[model samples]
Target chain A: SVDQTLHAPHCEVGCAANVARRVGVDLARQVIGAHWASRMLVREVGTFPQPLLDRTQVTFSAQGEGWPALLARMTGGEVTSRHVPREELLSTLHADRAEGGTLLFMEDRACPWLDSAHSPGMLPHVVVPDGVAPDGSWQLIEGHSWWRGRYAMSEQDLLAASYPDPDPHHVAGRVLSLRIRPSAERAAQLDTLARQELAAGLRTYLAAECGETETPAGRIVWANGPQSVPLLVERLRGWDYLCPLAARNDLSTEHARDVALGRYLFLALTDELAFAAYARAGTLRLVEGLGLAGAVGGLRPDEAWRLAWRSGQKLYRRLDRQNLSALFSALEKAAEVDVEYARRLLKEL
Target chain B: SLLVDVLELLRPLLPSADTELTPDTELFSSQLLDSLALEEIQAAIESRWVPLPPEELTLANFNTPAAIAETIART
Candidate 1:
């Protein structure tokens, strides 16, 4: 059975974090710490329809270290992954559960068995396998914004969803097994490591510059840190120049809606960053007995920032195209709150 | 008259004026004007007539030459 209490608000923090949250709240917080500590805005500019708010680049890793390695460092655990063939998936999952450890199911969202809004080759997703039934039915757990609960699937459904045919992105049939063993020494070191990483991340974000970098993907425009907010605002305020007038004319209203959707996506990203900051503040206070003496507006920084973020989300949902000016204003206000939160975190450290 | 004037203001901002535009042409739905271009249209309308209320800045009020001219007339 699924732990109904353990579910992430959305996929903005990535699927691995979602699965980790269900595994253990503390472990998930560590993952979120690493993710937001090293967060930056990498804007993909090209002729292709770019996913402006995608977090795939920084999801599982930060500072060039993969999540498995980071998890090992944090928990003193050994994490290993393997690609199980479709025929062997069921047996492998059953064996792993019997062996006693965490088992993660990484699959393509385009699978027919998964409820996804995106078509095949459009989105990537992952889930955790909770249990296997005697009748060959399996309980799959997902923490995505769209699918956040336990799903009962037949053995056949599990096999097909695990490794769908014509997997374009090649992210299927993969499973990660984790064995955690933490000591008093490792626990103490984990706090030190987190404080150091959080401080370093804040310094990097504050000092980030606007520049361009070349990668196999293409030329990426990096507006590091707070600069990303302004750049996104500018892009949202521009018209689509890539499509021909006739084509754009045919899709005018849809394009306008896309811009609005883009704004919401950006807000989600910022909201996640705020969550990470507040979580870091809580961690700092717990480890060092730090007080909220440095909080903004005489209110607890975390609660204040969350209230502002929720207001922005509410305004976005209520406003129409004509009232988007108000939406932008709300977004800017939220961004300002995030900046202050980050500064307060740095100050406490 | 008022329709031609509105079209004249929109023609420069459009990608291409080769497509014929009429008073009833769908400016917003047809992609003739986007949010950015709409800002320019708003400025042009205010300069030529009275200011537009924020509520009146909807696609319904300025999506076509006739619609824009009607909005300006009311203002």
Candidate 2:
């Protein structure tokens, strides 16, 4: 029997939002068209990277413009508010849908509904707000098929679960709402912004860590400029990746979109590097040492930096356009799947 | 003796819990230790005991204090 709340083994909370966003975006793209999600992601660049993980009650909730904004842009209208209350939730969603919109909100994973047996870091499951009864009970659509079926909870319990206000500061946070409308122009602008920012971040990292200078065209000098040293740039890159989540970290990810975009670039670079190592050694082992352990969200600038000074030197020695092409294709498929092959081997062992 | 040291090192990881620091305790069963903490634990063990080989870096081998101690003895 499929139990929605049953333990889906090893499903990290970190990936839950990714899952929700992926599903939601596909739906938006399906209902609307290409680039709607990108436009919303772009519009949401400033107010995202919701660094509220330490707060347990609200940790599971999707933070920032997130699913609401994406759904809104696809459905129509803009995300004009945050933490909508339970009383207004039903009416507001009703109003939005009448305007050709719908609502998507996170349910409390720790609530009695989806049982994980008090497991820490279980992702707060996602759902569509359906209806509310006059008796103050709420109806929700369980978006996932494997978990608990669609059900209702007391408005109070639902509100508490969404953002459990730890006394002294009583905050009644409501789920997010969305609408339908045209959003093509906004999509192109956001896409350009994402590309520019991603390029700038990679450039800043290269300059700061390897001392590399950017040049016109593809011509470039290694940061160390052929200096014989493995740059430990991975640490900074790792920090860049986690800084949005880290409370004390100085580096900021203007939006979660940047996190996803930066990762696509970062992982591509590592895969390019991994191929070089594989080609040099004619074995996959060296690629593992190059931080294949943290493949999905783990590859950093430092991993490639290590390879550059080590076996990559041999690669650099014999490096050619053909090799670069081979490298590009090599890791194209690696990061597509979320699992880290190296990490899995060790865990499975 | 090794288990004693390992237990001593691992005590800090469970700051709030009243888990029995015994040999048979299942470390990975519950969300007792997260991935980062697990990595930290591995680093700690390597600093004190035999460095874990990549091939021998199985979570199964280090599932418990006794298992970790036994792993060290065999290494």
Query: Which ten residues in a row are the worst by lDDT in model 2 chain A?
Result: A35-44
Output the number of the TM-score-best candidate: 1
Candidate 2 regions off by >4 Å?
A: A1-75, A85-87, A100-110, A116-126, A132-137, A144-149, A159-163, A167-171, A181-349, B1-75
Model 2, A1-349: lDDT tens digits are: 2223211111121122222342232221121111111000011112234343221110000011233444454434554445666666556666755433333444344345444544423233445544675565876544332232346778666656555533222223543444434356644444333333223322332233322222222222233111111122322223243233322334455644444444433333433333222222211222243333343244332233223322222222233344333333332332221123323323321
Q: What does DockQ give for each predicted structure? A: 0.02, 0.05
The candidate maximizing lDDT is 1
Fraction of native contacts, model 1:
0.00
Give the Cα lDDT of each candidate: 0.52, 0.38
What local lDDT score does residue A54 receive in model 2, on the 0 to 100 scale? 22
